[PDB]
Amino acid sequence: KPVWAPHPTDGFQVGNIVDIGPDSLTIEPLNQKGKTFLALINQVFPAEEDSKKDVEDNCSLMYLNEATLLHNIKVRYSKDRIYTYVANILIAVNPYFDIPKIYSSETIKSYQGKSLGTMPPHVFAIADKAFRDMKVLKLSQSIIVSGESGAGKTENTKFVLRYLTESYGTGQDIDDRIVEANPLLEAFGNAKTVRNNNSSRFGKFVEIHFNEKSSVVGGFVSHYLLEKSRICVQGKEERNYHIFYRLCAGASEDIRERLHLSSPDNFRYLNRGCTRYFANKETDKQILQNRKSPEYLKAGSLKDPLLDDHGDFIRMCTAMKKIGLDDEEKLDLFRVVAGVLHLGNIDFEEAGCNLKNKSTQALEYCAELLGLDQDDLRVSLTTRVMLVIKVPLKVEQANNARDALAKTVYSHLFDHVVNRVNQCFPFETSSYFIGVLDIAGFEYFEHNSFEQFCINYCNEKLQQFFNERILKEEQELYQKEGLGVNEVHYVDNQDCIDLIEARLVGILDILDEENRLPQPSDQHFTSAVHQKHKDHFRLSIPRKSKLAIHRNIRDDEGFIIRHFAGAVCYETTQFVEKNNDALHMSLESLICESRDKFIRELFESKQKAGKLSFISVGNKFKTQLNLLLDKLRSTGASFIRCIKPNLKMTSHHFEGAQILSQLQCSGMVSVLDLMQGGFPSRASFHELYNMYKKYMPDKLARLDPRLFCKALFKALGLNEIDYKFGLTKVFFRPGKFAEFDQIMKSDPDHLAELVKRVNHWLI
Numbered sequence: 001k002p003v004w005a006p007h008p009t010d011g012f013q014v015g016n017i018v019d020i021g022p023d024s025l026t027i028e029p030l031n032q033k034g035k036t037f038l039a040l041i042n043q044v045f046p047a048e049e050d051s052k053k054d055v056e057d058n059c060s061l062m063y064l065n066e067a068t069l070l071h072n073i074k075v076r077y078s079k080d081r082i083y084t085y086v087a088n089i090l091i092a093v094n095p096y097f098d099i100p101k102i103y104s105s106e107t108i109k110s111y112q113g114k115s116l117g118t119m120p121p122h123v124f125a126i127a128d129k130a131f132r133d134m135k136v137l138k139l140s141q142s143i144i145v146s147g148e149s150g151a152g153k154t155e156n157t158k159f160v161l162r163y164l165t166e167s168y169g170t171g172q173d174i175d176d177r178i179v180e181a182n183p184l185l186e187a188f189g190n191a192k193t194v195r196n197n198n199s200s201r202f203g204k205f206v207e208i209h210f211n212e213k214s215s216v217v218g219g220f221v222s223h224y225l226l227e228k229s230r231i232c233v234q235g236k237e238e239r240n241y242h243i244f245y246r247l248c249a250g251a252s253e254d255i256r257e258r259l260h261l262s263s264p265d266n267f268r269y270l271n272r273g274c275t276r277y278f279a280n281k282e283t284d285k286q287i288l289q290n291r292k293s294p295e296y297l298k299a300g301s302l303k304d305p306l307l308d309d310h311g312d313f314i315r316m317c318t319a320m321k322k323i324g325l326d327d328e329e330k331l332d333l334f335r336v337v338a339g340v341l342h343l344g345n346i347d348f349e350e351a352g353c354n355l356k357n358k359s360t361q362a363l364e365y366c367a368e369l370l371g372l373d374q375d376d377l378r379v380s381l382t383t384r385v386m387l388v389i390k391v392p393l394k395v396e397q398a399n400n401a402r403d404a405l406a407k408t409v410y411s412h413l414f415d416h417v418v419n420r421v422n423q424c425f426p427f428e429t430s431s432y433f434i435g436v437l438d439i440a441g442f443e444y445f446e447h448n449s450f451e452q453f454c455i456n457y458c459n460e461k462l463q464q465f466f467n468e469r470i471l472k473e474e475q476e477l478y479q480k481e482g483l484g485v486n487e488v489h490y491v492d493n494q495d496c497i498d499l500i501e502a503r504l505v506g507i508l509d510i511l512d513e514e515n516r517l518p519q520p521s522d523q524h525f526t527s528a529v530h531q532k533h534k535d536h537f538r539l540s541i542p543r544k545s546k547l548a549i550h551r552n553i554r555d556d557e558g559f560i561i562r563h564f565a566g567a568v569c570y571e572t573t574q575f576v577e578k579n580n581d582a583l584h585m586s587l588e589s590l591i592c593e594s595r596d597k598f599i600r601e602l603f604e605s606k607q608k609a610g611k612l613s614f615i616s617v618g619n620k621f622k623t624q625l626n627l628l629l630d631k632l633r634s635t636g637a638s639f640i641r642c643i644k645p646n647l648k649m650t651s652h653h654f655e656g657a658q659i660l661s662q663l664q665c666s667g668m669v670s671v672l673d674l675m676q677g678g679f680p681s682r683a684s685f686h687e688l689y690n691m692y693k694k695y696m697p698d699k700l701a702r703l704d705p706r707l708f709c710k711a712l713f714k715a716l717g718l719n720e721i722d723y724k725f726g727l728t729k730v731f732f733r734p735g736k737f738a739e740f741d742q743i744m745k746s747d748p749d750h751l752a753e754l755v756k757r758v759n760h761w762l763i
């Protein structure tokens with residue numbers, strides 16, 4: 001009798017059907033009771049008989065649907081079971097606290113060489129299946145860890161890497177380096193955002209390479225889209241990259257004086273954001289008074305279970321030593337970091353413009369740390385080279401020259417760090433790899449800019465990949481075998497991908513075209529997108545938004561993209577500026593020709609006077625992404641769907657509607673609809689024949705694999721609908737292969753008797 005009917009905060013609630021109607025159902029919520037509400041036919045789902053129980057694999061449910069999945073993972077989460085399967089897919093709900101011993105060395109050991117279902121659901125089982133499939137099928141593998149900001153992608157990527165190196169490594173401390181390199185990338189590429197204290201402001205693909213003997217030979221890290229806007233200004237509850245705070249909180253008084261550092265409130269590149277440190281009662285005592293901002297003294301420390309700006313600086317130094325990064329290179333990194341900070345403190349005033357007299361120290365400190373002549377820096381920030389004529393810049397143009405230099409220097413430093421990490425675990429050759437993808441998922445905010453557009457473009461391509469691998473190939477296998485399964489259709493998003501990335505006509509090339517025009521304009525670009533794609537299904541003017549908050553945005557000030565997971569309204573202001581990775585020739589020449597070898601080497605691995613300096617961020621990213629998707633399409637794939645349980649970073653706080661929405665946007669409803677009608681467990685006639693012939697009377701082996709299976713299945717008295725004979729394999733319905741392997745373990749005399757009852761000639 002019980003069903004699942006909608007609920008605004010829980011997603012679903014338990015109810016009973018009291019009246020069925022042509023277009024809606026009448027639900028009486030459980031133990032209310034006189035209260036009744038109307039729900040759509042397609043929003044009411046059958047519920048499990050036992051509401052207390054849970055299944056490790058959602059395919060084991062009596063009814064597999066979004067409401068039964070949501071309940072199952074809710075019950076598990078309340079019992080600190082954050083991992084649940086959906087056939088070969090893993091659902092990982094962020095616990096927001098440390099679940100004891102569940103990632104221990106003993107735990108790693110217990111998951112080694114064990115098939116899915118042998119052990120409880122775990123990120124370690126997904127990693128082991130990847131290593132085992134790689135070893136047996138002699139084909140590279142990829143693990144895609146997806147989810148919203150704060151979902152746990154980065155933490156689960158670490159668990160995968162740590163499991164694989166600690167389980168299939170050589171034993172020597174060289175295996176630790178793939179793990180020990182993460183605090184280093186996180187110091188430079190992670191930052192405090194409102195949705196995640198340790199947010200990754202870059203995407204990564206971490207490959208672990210192996211030989212023919214399937215043993216780690218090294219690794220390789222591909223980094224994507226480091227956020228540049230974060231380097232100069234942040235919102236008041238957000239911070240710059242972790243390194244800035246780890247250095248101000250942890251650097252010795254010797255490093256502090258040498259790099260001319262102080263409390264974060266003294267730097268423009270930090271003081272618009274949150275200037276507080278992550279500390280506890282113990283670590284606050286370790287931070288000197290000259291490091292603490294007035295905001296920190298007034299409001300105290302920021303709280304997090306793991307981040308500690310003082311302790312993280314110590315762990316980062318340890319990580320640097322452990323991966324082979326000497327003290328000289330350590331200080332070189334810090335020098336460039338402080339060089340960016342001091343650059344930010346340079347102020348300009350109307351003359352044409354010039355440096356403020358109060359900016360004298362900042363110019364001095366920045367030029368010394370970046371290896372530049374002060375006058376060269378002063379001239380390169382307040383003028384500009386045109387067709388040759390030094391045109392004086394206005395105060396706002398100087399601010400932009402300053403910040404563009406900062407963003408370039410920091411982005412190049414991050415490339416150095418990524419590449420340095422890759423040199424610390426190199427390999428001559430490899431047979432296969434296990435790649436782990438950790439990149440930002442689809443998201444919308446009140447304001448979406450070029451950064452979100454790029455992330456959402458990337459997600460459009462990864463969703464297409466997931467849809468093909470999980471829905472398209474699986475249904476093609478059912479049709480090829482002639483199983484006559486109900487077709488589950490998904491919306492093909494190729495037209496959305498094309499809209500963004502096609503050459504000449506795509507939005508990324510229309511943006512590039514704008515950057516190459518004599519007077520580039522965000523509005524001219526936006527009108528060109530709307531004019532070219534006026535009749536496109538995936539594009540709209542902001543006026544046509546379903547959300548009232550976007551209706552005032554002019555046609556030339558934005559656009560809507562109907563992404564796979566939903567419509568996103570973009571404000572196109574600063575799209576032209578954000579699409580350009582290049583510096584004006586004067587600034588590029590200035591920094592490439594630094595006195596300091598390390599700074600020059602940041603730009604090692606020529607523009608004419610009146611020539612345009614332009615490097616397309618969009619098309620550099622399209623290229624990197626097309627390479628990544630060549631790698632992913634070449635490999636076997638596994639999917640880890642991470643779920644953010646709430647908007648408060650709190651433990652044991654399951655927000656049903658928010659979770660349902662994440663499962664819905666990731667396309668899991670189509671997966672459940674496919675599974676509920678599909679056959680996830682399968683085996684060839686020869687595979688079943690070779691594995692189970694020994695258990696049966698001898699005469700059964702004389703039969704060909706197909707007919708051996710036909711005879712066995714008749715002897716066992718298996719439900720005709722529980723399995724389906726295909727052209728080359730037996731397809732087992734959700735959780736019906738387990739029932740078969742169960743009886744096959746039964747007494748051989750009873751198996752012989754079962755055969756005798758259906759064909760005594762086979763005795």
Ligand SMILES: Nc1ncnc2c1ncn2[C@@H]1O[C@H](COP(=O)(O)OP(=O)(O)O)[C@@H](O)[C@H]1O
Nearest residue numbers: 094096097098148149150151152153154155198
């Ligand atoms: N399994 C886990 N165990 C403990 N804490 C976790 C776990 N997964 C995530 N967290 C917590 O949630 C935070 C956000 O997770 P994170 O991996 O950074 O998210 P994402 O990379 O998806 O943005 C982490 O900093 C940590 O506090």
Ligand code: BEF
Nearest residue numbers: 149150196199200
């Ligand atoms: F905060 Be997530 F790593 F994008």
